[model samples]
Target: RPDFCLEPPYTGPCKARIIRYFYNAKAGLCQTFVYGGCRAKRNNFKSAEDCMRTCGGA
Candidate 1:
């Protein structure tokens, strides 16, 4: 999904330290943020490299 990059970062509601990566359109960079451990969203990635590769341009 090329358009997936434009989606906002969703951290869910649960409190957990699950390392995940998401693209921040404001800063124009992929950041490593902790996931909440449930109800994962499309913007979340297992690796920062993958996030950059997929959404680095847009």
Candidate 2:
């Protein structure tokens, strides 16, 4: 599995608006957040399914 799964959520600092999802390891699930439409480093996916597939439980 990718190490990005262990990363904490980050909303970034830009002002752009976009929906995104990130895995919550503590909760063992994916959650939604407002993306800045810029650099996200890691732990961010465009959809819940993608986030779950990459980091969520099998």
Candidate 3:
């Protein structure tokens, strides 16, 4: 991700830290991925600490 903080608003993965979680039917509690600048969802978190705070498994 570009540094929109100083430059344009073209934030990408490295722009920030994005965390999200979802239940895995086969393995266990798991989730997919987004860029680092992802937003807030029911499962979205700032870190695994946050993710584990709500849904800590696996």
Q: Please, what is the TM-score per model?
A: 0.76, 0.78, 0.32
Give each model's whole-structure lDDT: 0.78, 0.77, 0.38
What stretches of model 3 exceed 4 Å from their correct place?
1-26, 30-32, 35-40
Per-residue alpha-carbon lDDT of model 2 for 1-58, expressed as tens digits? 2588787877778858777788877777888888776667688888898888777755
RMSD of 2: 1.7
Worst 10 residues of 3 by lDDT: 1-10
Instruction: Tell me the spans in candidate 1 whose CA falls farther than 4 Å from its real position.
Output: none
* Range of the 10 consecutive residues with the lowest summed lDDT in candidate 1: 1-10
Candidate 3 displacement at residue 7 in angstroms: 34
What is the TM-score of candidate 1? 0.76
After superposition, candidate 2 runs with Cα above 4 Å error: none
* TM-score for predicted model 3 compared with the true structure: 0.32
Candidate 3 C-alpha lDDT tens digits along 1-58: 1111122122243645443333333343434545445433343434555444455443
